[PDB]
Subunit: 108 residues, 4 copies
């Protein structure tokens, strides 16, 4: 999938993907955007811990947590509580949008 | 694709899709969300014109336009100018989120 | 997903999808190919049973089974035992190909 | 897309993708299967030419050609003329299946 919704987490080894782009939460705690095999962007936090998870929070903050729940890296975009999405876009940009402004209200 | 970015248009017959969900801009100008063959939601504007297109504007407004560029239906969420996305989500909700709060800045 | 591999089954309500095309195993036991809301092809076996499942067998036969495991419809392409795939193609054709002729051998 | 149909070609830089798997026809003429950034399989023909293209032929043969149309590598599965598909499967195997055994005949 190419979208991480607020309230969701990407566990170790999990990722967002689109075409040849992979945004992965690595086991060495480095969050990396790859274009095939080339690292395009990273949090540069590899080695600081093991088995981190990525959380797209309801306050709009994207945070990498270690098992002890200490924040290793954050987008520092926390703020208003609502619904947000982190998207790995077709143009290779990873963007956080929010909050929701309109909906059809057809959610199950 | 399941995302319509601001600055984009879905021409007549074009759509957003995810699994069995299809959000289509029909030729009879009705914008309909289908779950397989069942209409789940619609703007109920079929017959009011022919060959309409759907525009996700930079002001956050989702508008259905007829060829003469007159708005047939709108979400009425127009406002701040920026970047927005209209997503046909995995939970079957069609939602508009915006503006962008953070990005890796890796866009080509 | 747009591929049903041999050894797999699509339970009631499950489907293959690609763009606006949905090949679904309905609860009324009718196997239907939809292009948005229009039925393009069907086995025309709706009502003959309830809760059927679709099986892409290892003998290359695509069979619709009722709960009592009696074949309601079949492609009648059963034959050589091997690996087959039933694909809902981008050109809107649903095709069974097989057997395998070559592989990288990189399966987990 | 995760399927290369017979009669199609993947030009230089083009690829098949599924999840974190990328089967790419590189500009250095090496055909490589990547699992994120790790090479899982390759034809090991990098440097033998520039700007090769991958062809899934109607005779069931998968061939890497250089601009001068000389075969750099082949699966050597050429044979019966018909319809074939090369699939980058969900189980990380890249497999060629063919020929077609059955179809709904709903192709546009
Ligand atoms: O250009 C962005 C960024 O790229 C490089 O950082 C990304 C790499 O950071 C670390 O070196 C690792 O996390 C590495 O990950 C690979 O190696 C790991 C250790 O062998 C392995 O566990 C992983 O599976 C993966 O293969 C990242 O690829 C670096 O150039 C940065 O300076 C730069 O900002
Ligand atoms: O915020 C007040 C509201 O909170 C609690 O309900 C939360 C749900 O409210 C609605 O049903 C939806 O907004 C639902 O979320 C869906 O729609 C969103 C956009 O409309 C979208 O962003 C989500 O992804 C999802 O599809 C909320 O989850 C509850 O306490 C209510 O009583 C209260 O009024
Ligand atoms: O429950 C939501 C909504 O569903 C129904 O409206 C959707 C239908 O609206 C019109 O009837 C048409 O636009 C129809 O579209 C189909 O028929 C067209 C005309 O034959 C055809 O051109 C299209 O390709 C399509 O097959 C929509 O499906 C209705 O029950 C609403 O009351 C209700 O709000
Ligand atoms: O707004 C001021 C800015 O406007 C003009 O540039 C617009 C581009 O600015 C950045 O490069 C990006 O924001 C780019 O959009 C990409 O990133 C967004 C999030 O960062 C994302 O929502 C988009 O989808 C896209 O990936 C903008 O397009 C120009 O006049 C600048 O000089 C000026 O500073
Ligand atoms: O052109 C192909 C084929 O189309 C038509 O058959 C498909 C329909 O067959 C039955 O009528 C039903 O299975 C129907 O399914 C819909 O209705 C069901 C009952 O209301 C419902 O449970 C399903 O969810 C679905 O909405 C199929 O759509 C028919 O014209 C054939 O002659 C023709 O061969
Ligand atoms: O047929 C003889 C063989 O059968 C049993 O092994 C079956 C597996 O054999 C290989 O490992 C693979 O073929 C594997 O299937 C993978 O590759 C196929 C193409 O190579 C592909 O179609 C499949 O989808 C899958 O990716 C088979 O599952 C076993 O009894 C062996 O001892 C015996 O030699
Ligand atoms: O385990 C499979 C296979 O892996 C390795 O071969 C794959 C690599 O082969 C060559 O080294 C290159 O084609 C390389 O491609 C990368 O480097 C290129 C040159 O810098 C660059 O142009 C490409 O974009 C790409 O980044 C492949 O990755 C090797 O270990 C084999 O022995 C082994 O069989
Ligand atoms: O082989 C004899 C036949 O060849 C020429 O027609 C080729 C087309 O024939 C059918 O229309 C289809 O098979 C079509 O291919 C579609 O269906 C295939 C399975 O049925 C599938 O594999 C393909 O991907 C495609 O969807 C062929 O392309 C022509 O000379 C005919 O006159 C002649 O009888
Ligand atoms: O080290 C990374 C950042 O860690 C902290 O920010 C994370 C926290 O921010 C907000 O308090 C909430 O969103 C919390 O849920 C979240 O954990 C700060 O120290 C920040 O400055 C760091 O950049
Ligand atoms: O008939 C549908 C709506 O049409 C108009 O709104 C559309 C316009 O809204 C803003 O002015 C901008 O976003 C424009 O680009 C857009 O066309 C209004 O009449 C509204 O009340 C209607 O609901
Ligand atoms: O009624 C549909 C078809 O049912 C039977 O064929 C299904 C069986 O075919 C082969 O025997 C095997 O592949 C079995 O696994 C499969 O169930 C036949 O009666 C056929 O004539 C019908 O068309
Ligand atoms: O060097 C790779 C292979 O090249 C040749 O095979 C490719 C040719 O095979 C069949 O003749 C047809 O499918 C042709 O279209 C195709 O180009 C052979 O030399 C083979 O032995 C090599 O392995």
């Amino acid at each position: 999938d190419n979208i991480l919704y607020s309230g969701e987490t990407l566990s170790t080894g999990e990722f967002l993907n689109y075409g040849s782009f992979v945004f992965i939460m690595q086991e060495d705690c480095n969050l990396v955007l790859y274009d095939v095999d080339k690292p395009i962007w990273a949090t540069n936090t590899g080695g600081l811990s093991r088995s981190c998870f990525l959380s797209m929070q309801t306050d709009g903050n994207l945070v990498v947590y270690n098992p002890s729940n200490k924040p290793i890296w954050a987008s520092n975009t926390g703020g208003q509580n609502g619904n947000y999405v982190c998207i790995l876009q077709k143009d290779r940009n990873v963007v956080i949008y929010g909050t929701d402004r309109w909906a059809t209200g057809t959610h199950t």
